[PDB]
């Protein structure tokens, strides 16, 4: 009855000026996603994505807009222990000059990606949306296993 719970850390990081809503800016806080796979035995899998939604460092900046290898080369990589499974997705601004005019989000060579936010009332729920798009095009969506 092995009860598997795969959950995939997912570090969603906002710039400055790239999701404000009508009253309320920015916050740093953690949402989840649960995807429960149906199994016909006793086993069953839950794949998770949490979700860390934070401010962009100030250093983060500095590194951004530049041109979106340029920039995920200038993250200098954050080389750090058991990254493997982990994934990174920068968050930028709709006239943001990374992606070229309309493509939404970018997947890098790694563990790594670049999503546009899009500046109104929600700002989080379509944000949201499109994160874990990215992610299970990314990692972990239900035919991968």
Do not use: W
């Not at 563990?111 to 729920?125: D, K, L, P, Q, Y």
Request: charged fraction near 25%.
């Amino acid at each position: 009855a092995l009860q598997l719970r795969l959950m995939v850390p997912v570090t969603v990081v906002f710039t400055r000026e790239s999701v404000p809503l009508d009253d309320q800016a920015k916050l740093p806080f953690t949402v989840v996603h649960e995807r429960e796979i149906p199994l016909k035995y006793k086993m069953k899998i839950k794949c998770r994505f949490q979700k860390a939604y934070r401010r962009a460092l100030d250093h983060e900046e500095e590194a951004l807009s530049s041109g979106s290898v340029q920039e995920a080369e200038a993250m200098l990589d954050e080389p750090q222990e058991q990254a493997e499974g982990s994934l990174t997705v920068y968050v930028i601004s709709e006239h943001s000059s990374l992606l070229p005019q309309d493509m939404a989000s970018y997947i890098g060579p790694k563990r790594t990606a670049v999503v546009r936010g899009i500046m109104h009332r929600e700002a989080f729920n379509i944000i949201g949306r499109r994160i874990v798009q990215v992610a299970q095009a990314m990692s972990l969506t239900e035919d991968v296993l």
